[PDB]
């Protein structure tokens, strides 16, 4: 039993809720919140800009030190950093950004990072400003992630389409 509330159960391990991941993060204090990161961990907009704003820019400060030490992530890769006031940990995962021409097949590799964590609050990778089809992203998620994933979908309209079209 865990503290996630109001989710629709899609599969044995995937749940989905129309929710603001920031607000859901502040209420649940999940062990892991996933950020829709880029390789530079520049949290300027979309989910990343919202999560970082909610941390009063502490996420960005920590991220800049991480990059200065380690260099950029790979597309499809991830790193674990602090969750600040939102979660114990933030798993920064880089899905491909279609608006940069990145290979959508790397989306499966991106979701594989989730399997290193028993339970996660997460957005749909490569959705929103990353330019992929959220329905495809949901399919890859369900077919790749084996751990327990609670997907927060900000847009109510999108959410209802994802539910209604789910196979
Ligand atoms: O842009 C957001 N979400 C999308 C996104 C963004 C970046 C990468 C992604 O893979 C996705 C999936 C989309 C979604 O889940 O709706 C988002 C969320 C909460 C917010 N609060 C204030 N502004 C917010 C913006």
Helices and strands in order, then pairings?
Layout: E1 8-9, E2 14-18, H1 21-28, E3 32-36, H2 46-54, H3 58-70, E4 78-82, E5 89-93, H4 106-112, E6 119-122, H5 134-144, E7 148-153, H6 156-164
Parallel strand pairs: 2-7, 3-5, 6-7
Antiparallel strand pairs: 1-2, 4-5
The structure holds the ligand O=C(N[C@H]1c2cccc(O)c2C[C@H]1C(=O)O)c1ccc2[nH]cnc2c1.
How would you sum up this structure, described in words?
- Residues 1-167 form the Macro domain.
- This protein starts with 7 loop residues before the first strand and ends with a helix.
- The longest helix has 13 residues, at 58-70.
- Helices cover 34% and strands 19% of the residues.
- It is globular, with a radius of gyration of 14 Å.
- It has one domain: 3-Layer(aba) Sandwich (Leucine Aminopeptidase, subunit E, domain 1), CATH 3.40.220.
- The protein has helices at residues 21-28, 46-54, 58-70, 106-112, 134-144, 156-164; strands at residues 8-9, 14-18, 32-36, 78-82, 89-93, 119-122, 148-153.
- A 4-stranded mixed beta sheet has the order 1-2-7-6, with helices on both faces. Strands 3-5-4 form a 3-stranded mixed beta sheet, covered by helices on one side.
- Ligand RRF binds at residues 20-22, 36, 46-47, 50, 123-130, 153-155.
């Amino acid at each position: 039993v865990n503290s996630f509330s109001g989710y629709l159960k899609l599969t044995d391990n995937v749940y989905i809720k129309n929710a603001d991941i920031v607000e859901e993060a502040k209420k649940v204090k999940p062990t892991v919140v996933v950020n829709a990161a880029n390789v530079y961990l520049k949290h300027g907009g979309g989910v990343a800009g919202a999560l970082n704003k909610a941390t009063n820019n502490a996420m960005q400060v920590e991220s800049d030190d991480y990059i200065a030490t380690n260099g950029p992530l790979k597309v499809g890769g991830s790193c674990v950093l602090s969750g600040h006031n939102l979660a114990k940990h933030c798993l920064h995962v880089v899905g491909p950004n279609v608006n940069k021409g990145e290979d959508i097949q790397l989306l499966k590799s991106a979701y594989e990072n989730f399997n290193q964590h028993e339970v996660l609050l997460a957005p749909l990778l490569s959705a929103g400003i990353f330019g992929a089809d959220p329905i495809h992203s949901l399919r890859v998620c369900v077919d790749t992630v084996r751990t327990n994933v609670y997907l927060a979908v900000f847009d109510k309209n999108l959410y209802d389409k994802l539910v209604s079209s789910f196979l």
